[PDB]
Structure formats: C-alpha cells, structure tokens
Symmetry: C2
Subunit: 336 residues, 2 copies
C-alpha cells in the first residue's frame, strides 16, 4: 500500500498511544482480570484496584482498538487477548511487552531524532555496553529477552543438527536461552557464551537452574575486544549484528569463519529486511529501534548478507524466515 | 472487529515505533526533500546531512509503512506525504506532529502506568498548571497548539453566528487561537480569555500580532478559582474538560450557566466517545493521553454530556461531530 489519506497518516502518528494503552493495561493486569468472562467497569475497578473512571478511560481506548469487546457496558477479552495477554496463556508475552518493550524500548526511542543524525547527547545511552553497565537495566532487559527467545530457540533446534561431541559458540548469547535450549536438546553439546559482565552474571544463574554449569561456560567482555575459543563446530549470532556498528560487520564474519572447524556452521539470526526494502515491517521498525542506542547501525538486508557470507568464503549459504514477519535465519558452512 | 492473531497484536504493541519513524523523518525534512522527485539513499544524504546507512534505515521503515515508495533503490513521497508532510503544502501538518505530538506528548505518555493508578511521582507533570509554570514549556505547547486550533476555529467560524454586538468568554482559552479567528471573522465581537499567567503573556503577542489588542482581554488565574465576567452571549470551552479533574465537571456546568445572558449559547469542544464506549479511536486515545498529566480526568461520552447539560438547565442541546473521528461539539442555549 501507499498512503493517500490524512487519516492514514494519523493512524501512524498516533500508534504510540495505542501501544501505551495496551502496555498500561498489562501493567495492571487488565486482561487477566477478564479471563473468567466479561466484567463491568466497577467489577473491573474492584479486581484491579484502579479507580472506576481511569478503568473506563483505559478500557474504552482498548475497545476502540478491538483489543477487548464492549457489549452493554460489559468488557471482554478479544481472542487475541485470551491467547497473548493473559498471564499463563498458551502464547503469553504480556510480561515481555510491559517490562522490556514498555519500560525500556519506548523511552529509548525518544533518542532516534538525535541518533539518526549521529548526534547523541552525552547523557544518552549509546550502546549495549553502556546500557548494560547498569545491572538493573541488564536484568529488566534480559529476563524478558530470555523468556521471549525460548520459543525461537526451540524452533532453531528442530532445524539444525548438533548431536555428537560438538562445541557451540554463542556470540552475544545473552543469558543463554539459545545455548541452554540447544544443550537440553543435544546430549553431548558443550557451549560457550560471550557477553557483557552484567549479562553473564545473570546468565550463570539460568545455567545453574538448568543444571548445565558443567556444559556451558561464559567468556566475559565486549565480543569485539575479547578472544573467542577456537575450532568450534557451530557459531550462533542472534540479534548481534543489529546492535553493533556497521563497520564491524565484515570482521565479525571473518572472525567467525576463522574460529570454525572445517564443516562448521555459522548461524546468524536477526532483523533482516528484503533487498527491495519494502519490509517486513517489524524487521524494519526493530532495526530503527536498535539505531536509537546504536547510532552507527546499518540496516541488514537478505542479499547483502548472503553476498558477504560468500565473499567471506562460506558455502551452502541460505537465508530464510525464522520468526515470521520479523527475523531471518542465515546459515553458512566453512568448506569440508 | 476484534483482534485474533499475533500480527494484529504486534501491530498495536509496536505502533510506537511506527510513530517515531514518521516523527524522526519530519524533524529531518525527509518528505520536503523528496518533493522534487525520487532520490537515492546517497542523494538523500546530501540533502539532509544524514549518514547514508541511517537514511537507508529510516527510509526502509517508512516504506514498510506505506509512507514513501521504494523503487529501484529510489524513494519517493506517497501522495499522502506529498500532501500533508511537505513544507508549504496547502494542507501540511508536519510541524504539528513534529513539535507537539512528538517532542511533548510522546514523552508525557511514559507517565501513564503510574497516572491510571493515580500514583504519579512528585517528579511528574501533574496538571496543565504545573506543566506551564515553565515559560519555556508554555511557549512550545501553545506555539504548536495555537497554530493547530486555527483549523477547528475556522470550521466554527463557518458554523455559528457571532454577529451583532457580541461579547465572548473563552474559559480555558489558551493563546486565544479561537477568540482571534472568531472576531477576525466577525467585525463586531468582544473577548475575554481566561487562563494561566504564563500562557496569557504569549497570546498578548498573538493578539497584538493580529491587531485586536483592544477587543480581547485576559482574566488571569485558575479558571476553577478565579471569577469570570458575567452575562455573556457565548462561553467557549475547548479541550478544557479533557484536562481537568472529573469532579470539576458538574460544577463547571452550573458555573457556565450563570455568566450567560438568558438566551445565550454554551459551546463545549472536546474529546468525546460515543456512549457505547467503542470510539471514535482518536477521541479515546486522546483522553488517555490527557489522563497522563491529569490523573483525575474522566472519560467524556456523548450521552452523559447531553444528559447533564439538560439537567443543569440548558435547552435544545446538540452534541455532534467537529473534526471528524477526534472531537465533538456540544451546543446548548440558556433559557
Ligand atoms: C538482543 S540481545 C539477545 C541475546 C541472545 N543472543 C538472544 O537471542 O536472546 C543481544 C545480546 O548481545 C549482547 N551484545 C551486544 N553487543 C555485544 C558485544 N559487542 N559483545 C558482547 N555481547 C554483545 C547484548 O549484551 C545482548 O545480551
Ligand atoms: C488543550 S489546551 C487548548 C487551548 C484552547 N482553548 C484551544 O481550543 O486550543 C487547554 C488550555 O486550557 C488551559 N487550562 C487547562 N486547565 C485550566 C484551568 N484549570 N484553568 C485555566 N486554564 C486552564 C491550558 O492552559 C491550555 O492553554
């Protein structure tokens, strides 16, 4: 589509108000209160401890987005709410949305006006490093990121095979959602994770909980300045490229190729747009979101990625969907 | 319609990114640069001082929203962008979105999680009054609001008749973006804008810079504390109820009755939702925005309104649109 109407501009301009309506409602557990059938405003005010008038304002907003129904002054969850926003639901990501997206991503995006001009102010967050140097920000971010990545990680295990005596290197593997999931799926797999000190310290705990402390080690520090383990059987880079400066992209590929045994696989998972630069929409929006605290980010597109991987010397290069409408999986092999 | 799937919820959850893509682009004159025809990423960088890789990211975001087209490594304005987001377009409104909605409203909506639980930090902006203690602040708000209320003000200069010997009382008046457009349409018209000292002073510049400095007055104070000029022919209230605590509503209804000449009309312009609580969307969202810095605000519906009016004494009250899909106009007449 190509917009023609002022209304269509308005819808875009005012989307942030929609997001915050959804987000506020999650913070006060609105959808969970409705899980047992429709409630009135005052029935809602009671269950949530909100004032009847604020709840009315919030629910009216939600209804006008179709997030809930409003029938005879009674509110009820939409099918989407039932599945995605109720604590416990099959596809729940309410906590992901209100913790990381709302409390962190929303505010940070107030920086893009300066970030896209490569003119951040001194007091702004200018990188993951700077950002995660606050241990409360590292946690707020990582807890939701970990829960959110389990699904995709389980999706990933189904695609690739890492059985046998194999070593995995996860550059920027956060708190181990991928490495842990992979290690639970493949018996003889040993993993190494590289990340920032505050992220690694939380990671250690997830790895203990899972009883994998004997199979998953952390190598702490900035991945660009720290040494990686050599002769790995596979290397994973999930949401790394998006949060790193454009000038670093080739060297990461070259380093990766070099730390891989012959026959080894490079796996890159990230927000990637199609080369026609038309979408997917969420990949592009997330790319812009990372630019806000990564002002030297370059947009990844699928054919650049394929090309650079071949330029780097990899083979059997493929790029395709991972999370539908949002991320792609690129896959490459060091010759054997 | 009700949402069912992930895409539809994501669309809501990530709408803020969409909004910011549009805003960033405006601050940097993207669409204005594209007005002379499609441009490569490189050519775009030349015209804006922005770095190529970053224009590419901004432009890709926008193309995926349909705001620009993307063809052969070139970007061009969508017809909507060409019409409404280019500097000097008959219907340009890019600066309003850029300055008020982005620079101010977006930041203020971060207070919403605490505001709907009536629990703002002392740090937070907790009312129009508190907000406008800062002259720097009162200026940037009205700057883009006053110039944005001209439209609605014109559409109301086409509607009612303020002809003859007529006095006006614009309670909660702002920098008089209404009072000004009214008289200027109606040769013989008075004026009496009540408001806040920090904003008054700005509008005095707006009236002086229009030539009306002797018809329009100002009655400094907190409309709820300060007394207004009695016996008027018309008492406007635009966006007032929206940013005032909901317990001042009924009493604002009685008060406004007094200061009119029996036979004089009252006008309420504001965000009002249909009684069934389903929209319009922009009206519902704006009430939520205003609740961010008005934690005591009440949601205005069309029925409650028409209802309480009549209940206060007014007659032949008429509640109807006004800026479709966003605001309504009430209209009553004093016995
Ligand atoms: C978006 S997150 C998600 C982590 C994980 N790979 C996943 O898929 O859930 C990116 C992670 O990479 C880390 N990271 C970013 N840049 C890094 C760098 N230069 N060196 C090491 N770690 C980095 C961040 O700390 C963050 O935890
Ligand atoms: C959303 S604005 C719009 C101004 C103008 N009436 C218009 O139609 O564009 C609300 C105005 O009313 C003022 N205001 C809000 N509450 C007020 C109060 N309790 N007393 C006096 N002025 C108030 C604000 O200063 C602001 O200028």
């Amino acid at each position: 589509t190509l917009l023609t109407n002022a209304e269509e501009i308005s819808d875009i301009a005012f989307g942030f108000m929609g997001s915050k309506a959804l987000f506020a409602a999650l913070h006060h557990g609105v959808f969970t209160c409705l899980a047992d059938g429709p409630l009135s405003v005052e029935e809602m005010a009671a269950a949530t401890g909100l004032h009847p008038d604020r709840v009315q304002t919030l629910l009216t907003a939600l209804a006008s987005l179709g997030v809930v129904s409003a029938v005879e002054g009674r509110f009820a969850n939409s099918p989407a709410a039932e599945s995605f926003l109720v604590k416990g639901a099959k596809y729940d990501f309410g906590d992901y949305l209100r913790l990381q997206v709302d409390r962190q991503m929303y505010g940070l995006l107030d920086q893009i006006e300066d970030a896209i001009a490569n003119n951040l102010p001194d007091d702004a967050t200018s990188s993951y490093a700077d950002w995660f140097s606050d241990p409360e920000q590292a946690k707020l971010y990582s807890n939701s990121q970990h829960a959110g990545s389990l699904g995709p990680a389980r999706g990933l295990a189904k695609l690739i095979d890492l059985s046998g005596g194999k070593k995995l290197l996860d550059v920027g593997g956060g708190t181990g959602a991928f490495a842990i999931t992979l290690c639970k799926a493949f018996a003889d797999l040993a993993a190494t994770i590289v990340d920032f000190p505050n992220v690694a310290a939380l990671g250690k705990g997830y790895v203990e909980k899972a009883g994998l402390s004997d199979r998953i080690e952390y190598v702490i520090g900035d991945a660009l300045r720290t040494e990686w383990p050599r002769e790995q059987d596979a290397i994973l880079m999930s949401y790394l490229f998006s949060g790193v400066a454009g000038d670093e992209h080739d060297s990461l590929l070259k380093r990766a190729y070099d730390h891989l045994v012959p026959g080894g696989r490079l796996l890159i998972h990230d927000f990637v747009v199609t080369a026609d630069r038309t979408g997917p929409k969420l990949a592009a929006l997330w790319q812009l979101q990372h630019t806000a605290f990564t002002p030297e980010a370059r947009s990844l597109d699928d054919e650049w990625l394929a090309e650079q991987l071949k330029k780097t010397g990899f083979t059997d290069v493929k790029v395709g969907p991972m999370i539908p409408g949002m991320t792609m999986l690129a896959e490459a092999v060091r010759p054997e």
